[PDB]
Design a protein around this ligand. Structure first.
Ligand SMILES: O=C([O-])/C(F)=C\c1ccc(O)cc1
Ligand SMILES: O=C([O-])/C(F)=C\c1ccc(O)cc1
Ligand SMILES: O=C([O-])/C(F)=C\c1ccc(O)cc1
Lengths: 114, 114, 114
């Protein structure tokens, strides 16, 4: 799976072990090995949410399976919790897009996952 | 909805209230109150379109509903007009990807929109 | 089509004609005219793969057509090849997401392809 976070929060505020933490947290939550988890954090972005430039985040979680109604609800609680505590972004100023990818549509190591 | 613009135009060429203008324009175009709109602009990018580095943009518009065939033509006219007028990007050097998102696949405020 | 590469490799490590090379290579692989190919490269990113900060890359290829199980395996070999040779990123530290876009959901030149 891969997780991307875009936020207007300055780089200086992103905690040092934040990416490794997200890796651990996601492994547990999706039940996928940490070896297949990729995390991408983009701070200092020029963004607005509800028309204001208060701290916000636009996130994306791509996974082959483990995506769905209940699972996504649990990912949102966990993820909003982490952004809130580590980056101090209010949970209602965060949008997370969930994508269930077909194995044939994910390339890796010179081939695909199918 | 959320709208993302990636462009090789420098940060300095992005007008001061442009994100607010985008927010207002999209609220009118989609019919969704500005309160539900997030905008993200990424300037200074390393990109080529048709093999050249003249000004260009790659955008994404995600919405829960309000997305579809004929309506996307309208969005393209509006959006390209704005980037042309404001950032001086030629319409033929702009791509916009449109995504209709399922509410169960959008996380917000600790849960999903489902 | 449009191709995006996000990497933690430094900007100075990206060879001069890389975007132009990707344009030709893509035109060749997909059969699409270079005129319609957009390339976006984002170096110096804060990202981890498998929990480590070693060179990695997260990419996306969007196309209207020319996307399929067999074609994607082919694109992946070519693309992981170029990234290893040119940016020295190990192929097992590269993800490429593939998207077959409906012509109606791709805006260009103030309209859509449908
Ligand atoms: O989640 C997975 O099964 C995985 F190991 C990798 C992955 C990479 C990119 C994606 O878009 C989704 C999954
Ligand atoms: O458009 C909507 O109804 C909305 F309130 C939020 C939203 C957030 C992220 C998306 O990707 C799409 C819609
Ligand atoms: O690939 C094509 O046929 C094309 F001319 C443009 C395009 C632009 C953006 C996309 O997301 C997909 C295709």
């Amino acid at each position: 799976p891969m997780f991307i976070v875009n936020t207007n929060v300055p780089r200086a505020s992103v905690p040092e072990g934040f990416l490794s933490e997200l890796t651990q947290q996601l492994a547990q939550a999706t039940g996928k090995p940490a070896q297949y988890i990729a995390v991408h954090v983009v701070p200092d972005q020029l963004m607005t949410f509800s028309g204001t430039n208060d701290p916000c985040a636009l996130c994306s979680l791509h996974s082959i399976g483990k995506i769905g109604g209940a699972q996504n609800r649990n990912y949102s609680k966990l993820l909003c919790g982490l952004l809130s505590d580590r980056l101090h972004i209010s949970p209602d100023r965060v949008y997370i897009n969930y994508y269930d990818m077909n194995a044939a549509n994910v390339g890796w190591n010179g081939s695909t996952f199918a």
